[PDB]
Structures are given as C-alpha cells and as structure tokens.
Amino acid sequence: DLADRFAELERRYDARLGVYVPATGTTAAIEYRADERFAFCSTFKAPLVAAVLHQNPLTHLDKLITYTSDDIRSISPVAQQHVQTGMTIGQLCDAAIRYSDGTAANLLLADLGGPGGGTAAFTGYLRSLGDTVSRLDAEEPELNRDPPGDERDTTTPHAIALVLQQLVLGNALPPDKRALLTDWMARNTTGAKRIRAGFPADWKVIDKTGTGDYGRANDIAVVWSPTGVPYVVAVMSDRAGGGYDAEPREALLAEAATCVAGVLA
Template identity: 40%
Template sequence: MINRPTSSQLSRRSLLAIGGLTTAGAAAAAFSATPAVAAPAAPAVGGHRRLTEAIAELERATSVTIGVTALWHDSRRAFRYRGDELFPMCSLFKTFAAGALVQARGYDDVYWAKPIPFTDADVVGKETRLNRMTWQATPEEMADAAIRYSDNTAGNLLLRELGGPQAVTAFARSLGATRTRLDRPEPQVNEATPGDERDTSTPDDIAFLLQLLLIDQGAGALTTARLQEWMLRNTTSGKRILAGLTPPFELADKTGLGGYGVVNDAGVVWRPGEEALTLAILTRTDRADAPSNHDVLGDVTRLIAAV
C-alpha cells in the first residue's frame, strides 16, 4: 500500500502539471501519431531494441501476449511494444469513469457529498466496500472504492451516474483516444474473450489518456487533482507495476483483471530528479484456463525502469 504523499511532493507534482496542456483540444493536437501517443524524441535505438527483444522473450517464456506503451513526460520519449493492438480493458475503465464524473460535476460539492441509494441487486459478486448497512453511498465514496480497491459495485454505480458505459467511450473520444470503448458494466466487462472488440483499448490509448489526465490537465486541473488523490493511494497494484519499482518513487495507478488470464496495470511513476513516466501494461492470452500472471507486469516494469 502506498503512503499519501507529503505536501512538498504534491508541490512538485503540481509544478509538473502546470507546465502541461490545459485543454483537451490542445492536448490532442499536441500528439500527432496515430493512435494518439507522443512521438519518440531521439530514442536510444540500441536500448529500445534490447527492450523489445527482452519483452518478446518474456512472452515466449510465459505464453502471455504483452502490450506496453511508456511515455517519458518532459522529453516526450516513447517506447511501444504492441502499442496499437487491442487488449481487454477490464477495470481500467474505472479511472476514466471517475474522471468523466469529476469533469462533469467536480465543483458541485453538494452532489459529491449526497448519499445515493443502491440495492442488493446492484452488488456485483459477494463483496463491496460500500455501506450495506445503510444501502447508500456518495459519489465520493463510489469513486474512492472503484479506484483504490477496484470495487465492482462502485464501478457500476459510477457508470449509472454517467448514464451508462457509452459515457466512458465518449469521454475517451473527447480527449482524442479513438480506440478505447466501453460497452458493458461489471462483471461482463471482464470476459476478455479473444477477438471480441467490446470493452477494449490499446496500450497507446491508455498511456495517452493517463498522461493527459494525471499530468497535462487535459480534463481540467480538478480532474487531475482528484484522480491523483485516489490513484496515489491505490491498494491493488501488488505484484504488478508496484513490484517492479525500486524506492523512492510515487505511483498513481489502476489495475484490471479478467478472464483468459488478463492482468493489466497502468499509471504514472514519479521518481526524485527524473521525469514522470506514464506506463501502460496490458496482457491477454487465447486460453480460457490461463492463470493470472501478475509477475509478468512487474518484470516488464523492471525492464522499462532500467532504460
């Protein structure tokens, strides 16, 4: 579990964000590649070639298909491996659902504090962090549970507040991510059937959106601040990106888990004296009985962090 950052650390992050783009239109225009992702600036060809070979070897060793997009914020360097391929999104959608809701209702303090009723029929699976004693939750509680704990019930309630999964698709498209789509709520979003384009995105799109939302203020300063607040305190990274980092660092991320062995993690890493790194690692397999290999994401993170 990641500790909440100190005020001095937040000041540093705020300076990074202030230097970014301030409107979705300007942000989309700043990225000219298709899909929307920053063009690499003078990449270290030899290092990237070795990184590509290492990830390909990891795929062969684990029988897991891996998609990676890494964006270094200040230099606009990028590394992509299967960056334009579609992968099941799973619970990564919860970040974008919360971001869309903050963008739409962020300054309505009464709305965020007002309890909204839900019923036993809304509960996905057997557990939820929302209060089943009162059967009410505020939008603040929904977003916190959906992002920090990947609570599926909370994720669906966010979608209900937005008007359905299509609102997440519209939000992503409004920011310039053209290959991200959400079609279904939990738990169907996690089916991850090979070849099914529903509820999918690309590593390029996910990295682009997270850099835009968490650093460049592409959906507004408040959206950036609220998403950072929730994602910096994420509890589900475990053996994924979190396991591949060496302290000191700060990590704001969101994970996903689905059928066919899908394990995802994506977020932003801040390290003292270094530029921010946005990292999206998505996986898939063709086997319904494939195990969830969390360690693959930690291994990929170690490779990226060493570049």
C-alpha cells in the same frame, strides 16, 4: 533490446504483453504491441472517475447514491458493506479506484450516462480526450469476459496511456479535480505486485489495475523519477491460450515494469 526482452517475457509467461510509455522531452517512446487491443478490465475505473469528476461540481461527490444487495453482481469489496445504506459519489470513486469495486463502477456509469447510456457516455468521455480507439460496451462483470479478439470493452496501451497522460499530467481535469484523481490512484490497494513492484522504491508510483478472464492482467500507471520527471506506463497482458480461467500472472507485469525502469533510469 527492449523488443527481445519483452518477447522473452511473453515466452516465459505464455502471455501476450502490451507496453506503452509515451515519449517525454528526454526519452523516446517504449512500445510493444502498443496498438493492439487489450480488454480494459477494471482499468476503465480511473478515467471513469475522471469522467464523473469532470462533468459535475465537487458538490456532486457528496450526493448519496442508494443501491440494493442485488445490485452487487461483481467483486465489490467496499460497496458490499452498504447493500441498503448507499454511498456518496466520492466514496464510489474511492472504492472504484482503490478497491476496484465493480458495483461502484456500475453506479458511477449510471450516474454518468443514465441506466442505459453509461458505457456509451464513458466511451464518449474518452472520445472527448481524443481517444477514438477505446470502447466500453458492457458493465461489470461482463466487461471482463469478452472473448479474445473481440473489440468490445477494449483499449490499447497506447490509447489508455495517452488518456492517462492527459488526466494526471495534462489539463483534462482542473487542478483540484486532478489532485483527487491523483490521490485515489496513489492510495490504490491493488497494484503492489504489478508496476509498483518493478520500480525502485524512491520512484513515485500511481496506478489502477485490471484483472479479468482469459488471464487478463493490466496495470496503468504514472511514475515519477527521484528527480520528479513523470512517466506514464501502461502494461496490459492476457493469457488467452489457457481459456477463460487461465491464471493471470501479476509477476509478468512487474517484470515488464522492471525493463521499463531500466531504460528510464
């Protein structure tokens, strides 16, 4: 009945909802618009940190990266406070995952692929994980603003779930690197009202959110049942009918996750 429940969510919230939960050995795949493109918004910062971690020795995380206040062209709660100091790469990975800092992400992009090639190199990193569908094309903030229907800066819940399933559950990062990506997302500050709110509090929830224009509200998560069985949950939504300033409805994501929690019970 999962289709009819998800469709009622789309009726009630006036939204397009995309859900993908990969099949496990015990469970079938839960999928709803799972192969439609949704904007990444800030969800790309999780694989972005993975890409930085993967390409460099843990020594790189202590390289201090300098930037100005004019480099702050986006919501940057943490970077905001060093508009001349500089941060260490590990702290940008931190700010980019936990506070969704936009400046952190732009700097992490530049670290990854240089001044002109950050989004191509990020995209290439996903390609190397077997994701041939996702694309990042702009930096912060333009990547949150592409028109509905535009393929630029989009992923699919299917693609980003499979990517996530390789980063946290798979062997895409060495144990220590994997451990730090898992740490940052589990200490996220932004996801309380989305997938986390839809899952019973003794399931473990690790996530990275994205929010953008056209009512875009995303959460990608790995969750662990009380007995430790891991599931990956990608929930993406937009409310494009309302125009660029349409309000995102976090509660839609929480509800999606509640349905997911009820079939993985």
